[PDB]
Design a protein around this nucleic acid. Structure first.
Ligand SMILES: [Zn+2]
Lengths: 126, 394, 124, 114, 288, 190
RNA sequence: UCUAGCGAAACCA
RNA sequence: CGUGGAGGUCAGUGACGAAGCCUAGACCGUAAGGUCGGGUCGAACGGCCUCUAGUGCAGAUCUUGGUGGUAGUAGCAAAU
RNA sequence: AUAUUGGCGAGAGACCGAUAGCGAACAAGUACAGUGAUGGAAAGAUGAAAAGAACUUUGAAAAGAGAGUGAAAAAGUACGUGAAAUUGUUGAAAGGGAAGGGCAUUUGAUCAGACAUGGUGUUUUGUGCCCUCUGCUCCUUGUGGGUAGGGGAAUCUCGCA
């Protein structure tokens, strides 16, 4: 359990931390676990998701679907993946706001910041 | 992929040419290249069992007791491909006996009346150039059909067994050189019995019979309705003198997986309640989890280890099950896509699953990934499918 | 039967509620076109709306205007459903109160118009 | 035995109909045409807590509670609690008919299909 | 944006108000332009189409597909023979109440050569099937009542014919009907609607077999089974062939609703089709 | 210590004890022969004890001695009861020789009850079950009601009836001057 | 002066 | 007897529907009250042994809110 | 070493759960009132996602009606749940300047009202922890517990069917 005094376990404080979080903390919160293959690739379980990479959906009503992230809607703690949309009765399209805890990353978009992050997290990066 | 489907409601066969990903339920999906009706003979005489000899001929089982050899041709469909055209060459009739079946209609678990069917259609010999095939009835009639040198089917013998024979499995593992022909069969209060027949095909000998278990939790007699069976490799280690050297497994009606070691003896050393409340089970296929082909041509699981055995069964409802050697459910197979009681399932080449039943849907499933490969509407109740070679046209 | 029935609903209708209850009770159980002609005669002060509870017969105009507006609405909805006009008679009508402030007393008016049935002479 | 009840009706407050704000529970006032509760109406000790079936009721939440009525079947009767889900109610009914205990409220949240 | 209650409610209500103002003005302006030209009226109605669920159903190949071997199956699993009329057997379930007896009395007048029994304890269905075969009954009908309400129907064709379990949802008696009508001895015509799927054609051939053929043209009576959204509706009516070309009706006998729950091969042997709520959640298949 | 343990169990919290609406108490102690939680009844308050109790099929007499107050894993002694009812009651009287009347009497009673429960279970297993219980979810029930209403309102079935009757009429299917249609009206169709 | 529209409060075992 | 909260326990109940509401539905209590059915409903809640109290309402021309009649009346800047 | 209802931060609560708790959970010292000093409210909950009702039509406009989304509009930005007072319609009954209850009974309407269907003895045949022979295994080592193989009911006997 909670051993440090400087850690707190109040529900009210925790929700006030969660909903009032700044966006730089949110991309740390908006994290998705990698695949078994990507864990076999880099030796690492979960990562902060961004928009350029590719993912699959492992829960929800749209389970067993996949795609590249269109945009990360950090303000709603959510992430619009391309091609997973509800088509309205006008015919227009609106994506389902997914949540990265229910997602599994399939193909990473690797960058120098990303490669250095994998290196600092102990990754066996090729 | 080419498929031949015994279509009950037409009483016919249908040839299917379709590629991987063909789904008739969706217009956006791949459509099948060719659908061909053949040999439509009314619902009174639908195809029961087909045996493909390598390409040019097939073997048909009627509901009229008639076994039919059919010449198979190919002709250009006028993306290019050959379609197949069928011509019956020889027929042997009059192999059913419903008199014992209407005689035994009182002592019967099912509510409908009992009619005879060709449960088993297969060669007697693991070696090729056999030209000596068996036809088993529900009446216990085992017929020895020879392909003549004039290319004519000729029956050699018609021997009797006990009444209802739900299933009959041959033992094709080892020593094809010796003239020893082992099979097993069982049915409604008809125990699993191992019988050797003579290689001159004039006499059989019952070599073994199973024995029932002791009474249950309620101190009731356990009902005996075995439904299917496969063989494994015999016992390793020291043989015990005069028991037998045979190991094999079976599925009952009442959701029991029953394993049999003849070195152990006649009672089940292992019987497993697979499903609660004794749900009926229909078929029984064996498979490697990685889609490998580990069985005989008659499907006998080429191993000694019961724990390596993995099976796929169906109920009389819409369910397809996987189980280990211990009875733990490995999963349900295509449960969200079928809507009918899968009358027929089959492991083709280790890595494909033939499904077809009351759903009027032919479903090629993957064995390993458990993904549906092909869904086809056929407009008929399905009881038997053979799968030809994979073709990948365009 | 929902099939041989059209409906009209009005909400939050800023009218005197008591006068609307009287004029809705006056119109109940009538053929639609006869009731509309009656309401036209009300506007010419020819025939008056009899007052029973909240009281003699006045001619409250603002009630009758919204009433025949809803009657036109129900007639248009019946013709969009494709009903007979001549069989069409008002069957149910109900007024009740809308909330007071968003001192005034507005109301929710509703009515259901229904085709008159005709039976079949039996054969043998 | 022959259950005497001593009072069929209920005991209501004086002027309980005259006002909607006033409840119907018994509260002591602080003519004689109102029946007042008192210890003379207390039922016979053998007959007390008896159903018209002639049993004493017993609330049952699950099967382990039902097994406590195993010996006292003819005296007691099991009543399924109001908040039991319908998966458990059929299990309780099958177990009770196996035990041969009269369920006071069968067919609660349940129907018989086919 | 704004999270005050009274501010946000007011603002969105006024947005709704301005929107409906503009929509009324726009439809009125289009109405004026279509007073002028009747073309662009047609161009609008051809342009945009009102979406309904009847318009938009998931494509099924069972729709408009011919049945293979339909005549031999039709004589086989169904009683479709002008030479052989059906013996119909009413099988009201064990410990029945009064309500199912009343509904059976209703169902007497519907079905031809109908025979009622009161079931007794300890008769298994195989024994009953054997006795009905020896008495040459060709189909049995089981009324399932519960809580003094008829809830289920079961239809079994006797020469190893298929089992059908329908769920009855809503029932209306004759007396609660306003446009009452009095039914007569005359055999009605029959109406079947929207049975176009393969399973739907199977159920349509079922009801076509169970209902009496050969109607009385003199006594102008009809019954009807409409299919809508896997809900079939039973009613029955009397004819007025008007000069005005629209036939006149009077709903004679009782009405109710049925829904197929289970379609099984044989006498309760193997289930071809079942209903599930996970089937219901897709909301666009409509397995007929 | 047994009366101390008993007055702790009685006057304070016996975890197995269940309070009836009547006022009577009931131990959920699995070894308790009677259902009750009384002085003789609690197996926790008594060190000499006995109980007829069934494991999956076979019924066993369970004996509890004060000699094994410690070691509660090795506490209960098990005896397989005979399937002969008379012989098993004789076995009870043998193993409870020089034993009190309460345990022998209630133990015979519990044995009879469990054997008759076995008989009724064999009966119910052999008994045919046409109906099976289904509880209906209110979510499902509300979808059924509202979607039946939406289907009936959606399908104007009466107009489609009029349509198909005109279809059968104009199609033929009634002969020349049918008994359905008046002759003048049919000539207006003709 | 009438109709129409709007529309109280005092008080109320 | 009832109410909020607390310790222990019932490996208590619960999205196959908790709590709450309605119930010209049944039952048990002398009563305070309790139990179940049905309907509605959507996410928590109970029994027992104890502890603790902001713990039980018809009134106080009590407080606050809601709704009547008066009354379509008075009357027309009584607020617009 | 002490005080600290302020500041800057933390961490807790047998505290209150929107008439409570700060006046203020919300754009609260706000709107507003007062010339001013000052006084000072009311106001939380759609849904998992707005997917917030395309399109047709009535309609000045407000509001509708078809239609559709949604698991649920028995969730439609008046929105969780939705009590009472009070209102409208329909049905039933009563009344004619009738007030209420208590007891007791009819009449009318209405509801509940077996998943009850077994026991005892005898008999037929079959099966198994029944019989016989051959074992294995746990200790609480006994008035024990579990368990295997083959044979038999030809005879007996128990249980089951
Ligand atoms: Zn106790």
């Amino acid at each position: 359990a909670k051993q440090s005094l400087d850690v707190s376990s109040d529900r009210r404080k925790a929700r006030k931390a969660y909903f009032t979080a700044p966006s730089s903390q949110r991309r740390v919160l908006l994290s998705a676990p990698l695949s078994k293959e990507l864990r076999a690739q880099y030796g690492i379980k979960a990562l902060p998701i961004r928009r350029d990479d590719e993912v699959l959906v492992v829960r929800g009503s749209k389970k067993g679907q996949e795609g590249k992230i269109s945009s990360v809607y950090r303000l709603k703690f959510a992430v619009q993946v391309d091609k997973v949309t509800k088509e309205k009765v006008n015919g227009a399209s609106v994506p389902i706001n997914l949540h990265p805890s229910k997602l599994v990353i399939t193909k990473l978009h690797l960058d120098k910041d990303r490669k250095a992050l994998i290196q600092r997290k102990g990754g066996k990066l090729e | 992929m080419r498929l031949l489907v015994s279509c009950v409601d037409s009483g016919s066969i249908k040839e299917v040419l379709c590629n991987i990903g063909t789904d008739t339920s969706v217009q956006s999906a791949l459509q099948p290249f060719h659908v061909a009706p053949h040999l439509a003979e009314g619902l009174k005489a639908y195809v029961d069992r087909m045996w493909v000899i390598s390409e040019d001929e097939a073997i048909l089982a009627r509901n009229s007791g008639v076994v039919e050899l059919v010449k198979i041709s190919k002709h250009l469909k006028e993306p290019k491909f050959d379609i197949s055209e069928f011509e019956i060459t020889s027929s042997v009739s009059d192999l059913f006996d419903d008199a014992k079946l209407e005689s035994l209609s009182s002592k019967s678990v099912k509510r409908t009346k009992l009619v005879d069917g060709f449960v088993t259609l297969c060669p007697i010999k693991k070696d090729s150039s056999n030209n000596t095939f068996v036809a088993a009835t529900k009446s216990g009639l085992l017929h020895i059909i020879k392909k003549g040198e004039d290319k004519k089917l000729i029956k050699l013998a018609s021997l009797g067994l006990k009444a209802p024979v739900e299933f009959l499995q041959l033992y094709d593992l080892e020593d094809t050189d010796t003239d020893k022909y082992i099979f097993a069969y069982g049915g409604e209060e008809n125990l699993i019995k191992l019988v050797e027949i003579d290689s001159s095909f004039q006499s059989l000998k019952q070599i073994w019979e199973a024995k029932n278990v002791k009474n249950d939790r309620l101190d009731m007699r356990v009902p005996v309705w075995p439904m299917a069976l496969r063989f494994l490799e015999p016992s390793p280690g020291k043989t015990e003198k005069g028991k037998l050297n045979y190991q094999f497994a079976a599925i009952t009606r009442w959701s029991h997986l029953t394993k049999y070691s003849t070195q152990h003896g006649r009672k089940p050393f292992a019987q497993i309640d697979l499903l609660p409340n004794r749900e009926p089970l229909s078929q029984m296929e064996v498979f490697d989890a990685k889609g490998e082909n580990v069985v005989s041509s008659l499907g006998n699981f080429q191993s000694e280890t019961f724990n390596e055995l993995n099976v796929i069964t169906t109920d009389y409802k819409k369910n397809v099950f996987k189980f280990d050697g211990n009875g733990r459910m490995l999963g349900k197979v295509g449960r969200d896509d079928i809507t009918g009681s899968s009358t027929y399932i089959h492991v083709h080449d280790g890595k494909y699953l033939l499904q077809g039943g009351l759903d009027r849907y032919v479903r090629i499933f993957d064995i390993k990934t458990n993904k549906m490969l092909v869904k086809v509407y056929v407009g008929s109740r399905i009881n038997f499918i053979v799968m030809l070679d994979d073709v990948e046209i365009e | 039967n929902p099939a041989k029935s059209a409906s009209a609903r009005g909400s939050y209708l800023r009218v005197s509620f008591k006068n609307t209850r009287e004029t809705a009770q006056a119109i109940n159980g009538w053929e639609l076109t006869k009731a509309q002609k009656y309401l036209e005669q009300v506007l010419d002060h020819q025939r008056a709306i009899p007052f029973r509870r909240f009281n003699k017969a006045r001619w409250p105009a603002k009630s009758v205007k919204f009433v025949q507006g809803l009657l036109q609405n129900a007639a248009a909805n019946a013709e969009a459903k494709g009903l007979d006009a001549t069989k069409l008679y008002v069957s149910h009508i109900q007024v009740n109160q809308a909330p007071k402030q968003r001192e005034s007393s507005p109301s929710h008016i509703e009515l259901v118009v229904t085709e008159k049935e005709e039976a079949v002479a039996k054969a043998a | 035995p022959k259950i005497v009840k001593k009072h069929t009706k209920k005991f209501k407050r004086h002027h309980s109909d005259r006002y909607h704000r006033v409840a119907e529970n018994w509260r002591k006032q602080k003519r004689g045409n109102i029946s007042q509760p008192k210890i003379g109406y207390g039922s016979n000790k053998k007959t007390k807590f008896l159903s018209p079936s002639g049993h004493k009721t017993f609330l049952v939440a699950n099967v382990k509670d039902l097994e406590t009525l195993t010996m006292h079947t003819k005296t007691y009767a099991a009543e399924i609690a109001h908040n039991i889900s319908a998966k458990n109610r059929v299990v309780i009914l099958a177990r009770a008919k196996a035990l041969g205990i009269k369920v006071t409220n069968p067919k609660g949240r349940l129907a018989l299909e086919a | 944006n704004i999270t005050n209650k009274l501010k946000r409610q007011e603002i969105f209500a006024d947005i709704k108000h301005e929107k409906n103002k503009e929509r009324h003005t726009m439809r009125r302006k289009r109405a004026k332009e279509e007073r002028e030209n009747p073309e662009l009226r047609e161009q609008r109605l051809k342009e945009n189409v009102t979406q309904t669920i009847e318009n938009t159903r998931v494509y099924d190949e069972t729709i408009n597909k011919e049945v293979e071997g339909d005549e031999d199956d039709l004589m086989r699993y169904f009683n479709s023979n002008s030479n052989e009329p059906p013996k119909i057997f009413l099988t009201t379930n064990v410990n029945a109440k009064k309500s199912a007896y009343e509904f059976a009395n209703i169902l007497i007048e519907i079905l031809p050569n109908v025979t009622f029994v009161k079931r007794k304890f300890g008769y298994k269905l195989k024994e009953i099937s054997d006795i009905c075969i020896k008495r040459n009954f060709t189909d049995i009908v089981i009324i399932n009542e519960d809580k003094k309400k008829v809830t289920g129907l079961t239809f079994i064709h006797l020469p190893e014919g298929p089992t059908f379990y329908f769920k009855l949802s809503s029932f209306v008696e004759v007396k609660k009907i306003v446009g009452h009508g009095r039914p007569t001895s005359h055999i009605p015509e029959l109406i079947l609607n929207n049975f176009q799927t393969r399973l739907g054609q199977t159920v349509g051939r079922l009801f076509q077999s169970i209902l009496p053929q050969n109607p009385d043209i003199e006594g102008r009576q009809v019954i009807t089974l409409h299919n809508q959204r896997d809900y079939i509706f039973f009613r029955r009516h009397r004819y007025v062939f008007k000069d005005n070309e629209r036939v006149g009706l009077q709903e004679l006998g009782p009405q109710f609703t049925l829904k197929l729950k289970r379609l099984q091969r044989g006498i309760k042997e193997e289930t071809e089709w079942e209903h599930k709520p996970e089937m219901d959640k897709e909301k666009k298949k409509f397995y007929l | 210590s047994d009366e101390i343990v008993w007055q702790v169990i009685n006057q304070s919290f016996c975890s197995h004890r269940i309070k009836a609406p009547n006022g009577q108490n009931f131990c959920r102690n699995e070894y308790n022969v009677t259902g009750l939680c009384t002085r003789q009844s609690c197996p926790l308050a008594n060190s000499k004890y006995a109980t007829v109790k069934c494991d999956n099929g076979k019924l066993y007499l369970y004996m509890k001695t004060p000699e094994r107050a410690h070691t509660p894993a090795k506490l209960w002694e098990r005896i397989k009861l005979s399937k002969n009812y008379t012989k098993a009651l004789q076995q009870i009287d043998e193993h409870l020789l020089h034993w009190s009347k309460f345990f022998r009497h209630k133990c015979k009673q519990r044995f009879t009850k469990l054997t008759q429960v076995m008989i009724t279970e064999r009966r119910l297993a052999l008994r045919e079950e046409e109906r099976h219980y289904v509880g209906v979810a209110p979510k499902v029930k509300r979808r059924e009601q509202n979607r039946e209403r939406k289907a009936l309102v959606a399908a104007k079935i009466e107009k489609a009836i009029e349509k198909e009757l005109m279809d059968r009429l104009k199609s033929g299917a009634y002969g020349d001057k049918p008994l359905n249609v008046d002759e003048k009206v049919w000539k207006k169709i003709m």
